[PDB]
Design an enzyme around this catalytic site. Structure first.
Site, short mmCIF file in Angstrom:
data_model
loop_
_atom_site.label_atom_id
_atom_site.label_comp_id
_atom_site.label_asym_id
_atom_site.label_seq_id
_atom_site.Cartn_x
_atom_site.Cartn_y
_atom_site.Cartn_z
N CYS A 120 -0.85 92.79 22.25
CA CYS A 120 0.12 93.86 22.50
C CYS A 120 -0.54 95.18 22.90
O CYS A 120 0.10 96.05 23.50
CB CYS A 120 0.98 94.06 21.26
SG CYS A 120 0.02 94.11 19.69
N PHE A 121 -1.80 95.36 22.54
CA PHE A 121 -2.52 96.59 22.85
C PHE A 121 -3.71 96.33 23.80
O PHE A 121 -4.47 97.25 24.09
CB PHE A 121 -3.02 97.25 21.56
CG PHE A 121 -1.93 97.52 20.55
CD1 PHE A 121 -0.64 97.85 20.96
CD2 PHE A 121 -2.19 97.46 19.19
CE1 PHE A 121 0.36 98.10 20.04
CE2 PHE A 121 -1.19 97.71 18.26
CZ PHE A 121 0.09 98.03 18.69
#
EC number: 2.3.2.26
Lengths: 374, 73
Positions: A347-348
């Site tokens: 997600c990052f």
């Protein structure tokens, strides 16, 4: 640097399965460029599923190579997965990641469309044509009937995941939390309740139903409001390519099978990577880019999938890398000890790279993590 | 600036806030809209419990950041 997973062996066997079950003659697909979705929907659904294993013959009306079979797979894939049509939705902001929309019920025939999308994706794989789907690795894990994990969850809904972690780590009884084994879901303004356990209004305690609670919430979250859509997709798919044929593959191999290989440019990658508690002058970072240099594109893709959740690169290179919170460049963060394995947060677009003591140690640890994980 | 306050129970709200706002202000707005006394509320953000006295800025809570609310018995 290389690593064989037996991927060539798997691919060759999967292709042989498809080709050895090819059917004679063709299917004719007659469409308009401006009515592509509807024309393809009607014609494909009126055909028997096994017809889709015949050679494909596409006609763009008013124009005139498969070839433009390729054009059809391209144009139609981007249309059916367009959030404009309420069947699929972007995951977090965009990320070029697409997931099933729970509010697809807005169209009373949405299950007929998901059946067709299933057939269409199976058709692409069967015919060895690549698609730009934005399906997540947890979606592929579902196609393979593989266990979905709590790390899988972090990739799907970061804050939900973070909340379950906070529960996991803290004493909920000392905080005096009131929670029950039931969850409500609002879709298009309609609320429906779901007991996670029989008679689920039934209190969460530090232990040890909180672990049981967390795992039930995890399993529930993955299919939240999309069970019927997901079944319709999988059923349509299975009609054309038996899901059992995919069992050669893991979810990352499946993604490559479907979407194709990309050439990963080292220079573009290095220039657009940022660091936390490291710099470009950290010896682990120097080793990292040396590693990436020595490795072939298949290992590069598998490293990309590990850290970003996909083998596919955005138009505009690594400078335009998206994370589930908006634009987020590839990031490498120093964590833990030389003992630790590498970890990631897709997600990052974040690699947690431990401070390894040698180049060889880093190479061995990282190869293990990207080839034998998630 | 908007922030979502979500629950594991499944209900949600949206709040208009200021980066300068304290957690006790937030819990007040929650009481205003939801009827829940702030003494029963527990807010978290990114695995961290939020203490009254700290502002939404001390945590980098920004636009469309999602807090999770837990209720006390």
């Amino acid at each position: 640097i290389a690593y064989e997973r037996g991927f060539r062996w798997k691919l060759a066997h999967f292709r042989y399965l498809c080709q050895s079950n090819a059917l004679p003659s063709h299917v004719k697909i007659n469409v308009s460029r401006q009515t592509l979705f509807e024309d393809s929907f009607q014609q494909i659904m009126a055909l028997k599923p096994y017809d889709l294993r015949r050679r494909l013959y596409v006609i763009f009306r008013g124009e005139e190579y498969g070839g433009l079979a390729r054009e059809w797979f391209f144009l139609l894939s981007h249309e059916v997965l367009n959030p404009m049509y309420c069947l699929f939705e972007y995951a977090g902001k965009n990320n070029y990641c697409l997931q099933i929309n729970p509010a697809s019920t807005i169209n009373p025939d949405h299950l007929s469309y998901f059946c067709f999308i299933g057939r269409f994706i199976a058709m692409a794989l069967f015919h060895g044509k690549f698609i730009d789907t934005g399906f997540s690795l947890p979606f592929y894990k579902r196609m393979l009937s593989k266990k979905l994990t709590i790390k899988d969850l972090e990739s799907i809904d970061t804050e939900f995941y973070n909340s379950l972690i906070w529960i996991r780590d803290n004493n909920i009884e000392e905080c005096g939390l009131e929670m029950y084994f039931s969850v409500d879901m609002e879709i298009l303004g309609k609320v429906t309740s779901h007991d996670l356990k029989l008679g689920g209004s039934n209190i969460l305690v530090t232990e040890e139903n909180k672990d049981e609670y967390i795992g039930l919430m995890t399993e529930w979250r993955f299919s939240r409001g999309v069970q019927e859509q997901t079944k319709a997709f999988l059923d349509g798919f299975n009609e054309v390519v038996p899901l059992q044929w995919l069992q050669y593959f893991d979810e990352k191999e499946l993604e490559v099978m479907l979407c194709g290989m990309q050439e990963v440019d080292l220079a573009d990658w290095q220039r657009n990577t940022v660091y936390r508690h490291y710099t470009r002058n950290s010896k682990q970072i120097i080793w990292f880019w040396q590693f990436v240099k020595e490795t072939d594109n298949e290992v590069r893709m598998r490293l990309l999938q590990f850290v970003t959740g996909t083998c596919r690169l955005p138009l505009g290179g690594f400078a335009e890398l998206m994370g589930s919170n908006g634009p987020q460049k590839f990031c490498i963060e120093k964590v833990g000890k030389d003992t630790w394995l590498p970890r990631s947060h897709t997600c990052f677009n974040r690699l947690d790279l431990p401070p390894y003591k040698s180049y060889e140690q880093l190479k061995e640890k990282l190869l293990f993590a990207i080839e034998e994980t998630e | 600036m908007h922030i979502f306050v979500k629950t594991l129970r499944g209900w949600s709200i949206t709040l208009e806030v200021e980066p300068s706002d304290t957690i006790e202000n937030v819990k007040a707005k929650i009481q205003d809209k939801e009827g829940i006394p702030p003494d029963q509320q527990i807010l978290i953000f990114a695995r961290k419990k939020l203490e009254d006295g700290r502002t939404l800025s001390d945590y980098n809570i920004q636009e469309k950041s999602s807090l999770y609310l837990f209720l006390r018995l």
